[PDB]
Design an enzyme around this catalytic site. Structure first.
Site, PDB file in Angstrom:
ATOM      1  N   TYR A 297      -9.179  -9.282  21.473  1.00  9.70           N
ATOM      2  CA  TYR A 297     -10.565  -8.641  20.254  1.00  9.70           C
ATOM      3  C   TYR A 297     -10.001  -7.882  19.373  1.00  9.70           C
ATOM      4  CZ  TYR A 297      -7.358  -4.745  22.992  1.00  9.70           C
ATOM      5  OH  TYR A 297      -6.182  -4.673  23.329  1.00  9.70           O
TER       6      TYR A 297
ATOM      7  N   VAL B  63      -7.840  -4.822  17.509  1.00  6.71           N
ATOM      8  CA  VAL B  63      -7.034  -4.010  17.854  1.00  6.71           C
ATOM      9  C   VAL B  63      -6.954  -2.321  18.283  1.00  6.71           C
ATOM     10  CG1 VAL B  63      -8.030  -2.935  15.019  1.00  6.71           C
ATOM     11  CG2 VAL B  63      -5.955  -1.904  15.304  1.00  6.71           C
TER      12      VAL B  63
ATOM     13  N   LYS C  47     -10.495   0.645  20.959  1.00  8.77           N
ATOM     14  CA  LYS C  47     -10.793  -0.392  21.079  1.00  8.77           C
ATOM     15  C   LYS C  47     -11.311  -1.104  20.159  1.00  8.77           C
ATOM     16  CE  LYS C  47     -11.231  -4.867  24.110  1.00  8.77           C
ATOM     17  NZ  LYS C  47     -10.186  -5.559  25.302  1.00  8.77           N
TER      18      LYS C  47
ATOM     19  N   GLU D 243     -10.123   7.244  26.860  1.00 11.26           N
ATOM     20  CA  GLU D 243      -9.766   8.159  27.300  1.00 11.26           C
ATOM     21  C   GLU D 243      -8.457   7.228  26.984  1.00 11.26           C
ATOM     22  OE1 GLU D 243      -7.554   9.334  32.098  1.00 11.26           O
ATOM     23  OE2 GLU D 243      -9.018   8.333  32.011  1.00 11.26           O
TER      24      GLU D 243
ATOM     25  N   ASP E 224      -5.012  -9.225  36.383  1.00 12.76           N
ATOM     26  CA  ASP E 224      -4.673  -9.068  35.945  1.00 12.76           C
ATOM     27  C   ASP E 224      -3.545  -7.295  36.041  1.00 12.76           C
ATOM     28  OD1 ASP E 224      -3.264  -9.950  33.958  1.00 12.76           O
ATOM     29  OD2 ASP E 224      -4.131  -9.433  32.171  1.00 12.76           O
TER      30      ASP E 224
ATOM     31  N   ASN F 226      -0.467  -3.136  31.957  1.00 13.11           N
ATOM     32  CA  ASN F 226      -1.687  -2.374  32.029  1.00 13.11           C
ATOM     33  C   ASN F 226      -1.698  -1.038  32.388  1.00 13.11           C
ATOM     34  OD1 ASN F 226      -2.704  -4.662  30.600  1.00 13.11           O
ATOM     35  ND2 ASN F 226      -2.981  -6.455  32.301  1.00 13.11           N
TER      36      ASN F 226
END
Ligand SMILES: O=C(O)Cn1cc(Br)cn1
Ligand SMILES: O=C(O)Cn1cc(Br)cn1
Ligand SMILES: O=C(O)Cn1cc(Br)cn1
Lengths: 262, 302
Positions: B19, B21, B37, B85, B131, B136
């Site tokens: 996507y 930065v 994001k 968040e 994932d 993550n």
């Protein structure tokens, strides 16, 4: 086993029940549409059935698209010359959500026969996302049907396919089917298929899970049985064509019962 | 939703991906620190990416204290901003910077317990992560840990259908995916957490393979090569090969020696070959391994 998520199917069922109410289109939306009619919408959904068949899309993708469309047309008023554009963007979105290999935007542009540009499809995609506030994980008839199927003793592939068929027919006709929740149509579809094929009825075990009874499901069942009976006469035939295929066990060739004995 | 870009001040870059930065940012009106994001849609003549459609559609409905919260989506003609968040750190950096002599057993228990809560919540809402890896899992200053990065997540039906095969970072990827099975379910995320549990104890990945076939081989050398007795149907799986070496299963006491009986019991149930017998997050919450976890459940935020 785990593929039927024993430890979560109830939580999921309950959650889909809550969500189907949140994602519900306005029942009366079409009268408030100045320039489009149930007939135009039937034409559109039938076209989307064909598109789905052409690009070998999941049936879930189809149900999702129709859900997006009906919710969209619940708040946004659309000229007849733009209805297909809404539908196209809906199919794109649903494809991107549900498909492992979604068709490219250019393919979506191509199926409209240069009625619309790539820019218009992408701009409408954006509009639809805005209008639904990205709420795309909608409960569908299929998501209920597949759960109900687990209550067949034993499984019949003709019952399963026939139920899918009936549920798909329901997408075409906003009157009457806008007024029933996916879980209710699925319940009718399942009972009608089971009766048609094996003579049996909506099982006790499914009453214990849905709280639904033949009594509660009767309005929908009467509507659905009419739709089944008149299906060879309907202006729209794409679903019937699709379900002649061996993939779906040729179920559109079965004869409807003349009576439900309800 | 509430916001616009004018009310945020950028503080620093904190990551990137497909996507684009991610920035640490500060709401100038409320004071709230967020992660922003950025998704670029102008470079995308394929429209809004499916990855983002799934991330947004699914995160909207997953309010849980152990799932990173999507606070807002700012939708310009040209750009798409996901407001999350903010959490200061991930488990990989923690384990690589502050956990060199180890993560203490209290903190492992707490983390695993919280992860299981978040996962059970996902599965309860028809959502596979697909994932789960330390990178993550975000930790905050209060000792909360939370599932993040739903870019590869998916809404499932019951029973499941065939989904994407290129799912899960290889080190964390379940045998059933490696063997090319037509169907995978909630057990694949449990596998991942099993791997992560082991990793938290040792500070090293459990199955660090360089290929799919190497990944399988490393798994088999640890848990023994599966047969019809341990995993009915295995030898019929699409990418199962009769030629597979037949390694013996080793005692979990040797797999992760520092682990106690309760931990070893849980780990073995998380790493069971047969997905049908692998423990569910929901069941795992009640495992004796967690009898002494003390941390007040974190609060779900607004
Ligand atoms: O041709 C028209 O403008 C009317 N119509 C649009 C659809 Br889609 C279906 N009917
Ligand atoms: O069938 C086609 O290719 C053209 N078409 C679009 C609608 Br809506 C209905 N028909
Ligand atoms: O993205 C922009 O150009 C505007 N903006 C960036 C931050 Br961080 C907060 N607002």
């Amino acid at each position: 086993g785990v593929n039927e998520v024993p430890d979560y199917h109830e939580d999921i069922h309950t959650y889909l029940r809550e969500m189907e109410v949140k994602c519900k289109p306005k029942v009366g939306y079409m009268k408030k549409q100045p320039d489009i009619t149930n007939s135009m919408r039937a034409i559109l959904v039938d076209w989307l059935v064909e598109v789905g068949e052409e690009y070998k899309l999941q049936n879930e993708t189809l149900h999702l698209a129709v859900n997006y469309i009906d919710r969209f047309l619940s708040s946004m008023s659309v000229l007849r010359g733009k209805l297909q554009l809404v539908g196209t963007a809906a199919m794109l979105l649903a494809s991107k959500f549900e498909e492992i290999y979604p068709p490219e935007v250019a393919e979506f542009v191509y199926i409209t026969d240069d009625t619309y540009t790539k820019k218009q499809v992408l701009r409408m995609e954006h509009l639809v996302l805005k209008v639904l506030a990205f709420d795309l994980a909608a409960p569908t008839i299929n998501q209920f049907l597949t759960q109900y199927f687990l209550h067949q003793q034993p499984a019949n592939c003709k019952v399963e396919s026939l139920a899918m068929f009936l549920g798909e027919l329901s997408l075409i006709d906003a009157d009457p089917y806008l007024k029933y929740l996916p879980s209710v149509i699925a319940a009718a579809a399942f009972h009608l298929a089971l009766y048609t094929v094996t003579g049996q009825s909506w099982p006790e075990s499914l009453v214990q899970k849905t709280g639904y009874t033949l009594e509660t499901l009767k309005p929908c069942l009467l509507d659905l049985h009419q739709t089944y009976l008149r299906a060879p006469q309907h202006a729209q035939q794409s679903i019937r064509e699709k379900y002649k295929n061996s993939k779906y066990h040729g179920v559109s060739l079965l004869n409807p019962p003349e009576t439900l004995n309800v | 939703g509430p916001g616009s870009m004018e009310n945020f001040q950028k503080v620093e870059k904190i990551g990137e991906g497909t996507y684009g930065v991610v920035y640490k940012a500060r709401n100038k009106l409320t004071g709230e620190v967020v992660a922003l994001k950025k998704i670029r849609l102008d470079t995308e003549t394929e429209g809004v990416p499916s990855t983002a459609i799934r991330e947004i559609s699914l995160l909207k409905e997953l309010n849980h204290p152990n799932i990173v919260k999507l606070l807002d989506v700012i939708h310009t003609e040209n750009k798409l901003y996901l407001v999350f968040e903010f959490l200061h750190q991930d488990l990989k950096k923690f384990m690589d910077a502050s956990a060199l002599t180890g993560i203490p057993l209290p903190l492992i228990k707490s983390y695993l317990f919280q992860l299981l809560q978040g996962l059970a919540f996902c599965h309860s809402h028809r959502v596979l992560h697909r994932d789960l890896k330390p990178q993550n899992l975000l930790i905050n200053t209060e000792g909360a840990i939370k599932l993040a990065d739903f870019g590869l997540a998916r809404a499932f039906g019951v029973p499941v259908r065939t989904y994407t095969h290129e799912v899960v970072t290889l080190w964390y990827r379940a045998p059933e995916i490696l063997l090319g099975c037509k169907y995978y379910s909630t057990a694949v995320d449990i596998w991942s957490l099993g791997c992560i549990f082991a990793e938290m104890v040792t500070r090293r990945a459990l199955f660090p393979g360089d290929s799919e076939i190497d990944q399988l081989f490393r798994i088999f050398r640890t848990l023994g090569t599966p047969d019809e007795v341990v995993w009915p149907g295995v030898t019929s799986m699409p990418d199962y090969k009769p030629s597979f070496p037949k390694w013996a299963r080793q005692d979990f006491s040797k797999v992760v020696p520092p682990l106690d009986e309760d931990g070893r019991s849980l780990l073995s149930q998380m790493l069971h070959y047969d997905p049908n017998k692998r423990i569910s997050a929901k069941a795992a919450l009640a495992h004796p391994f967690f009898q002494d976890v003390t941390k007040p459940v974190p609060h779900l935020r607004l």
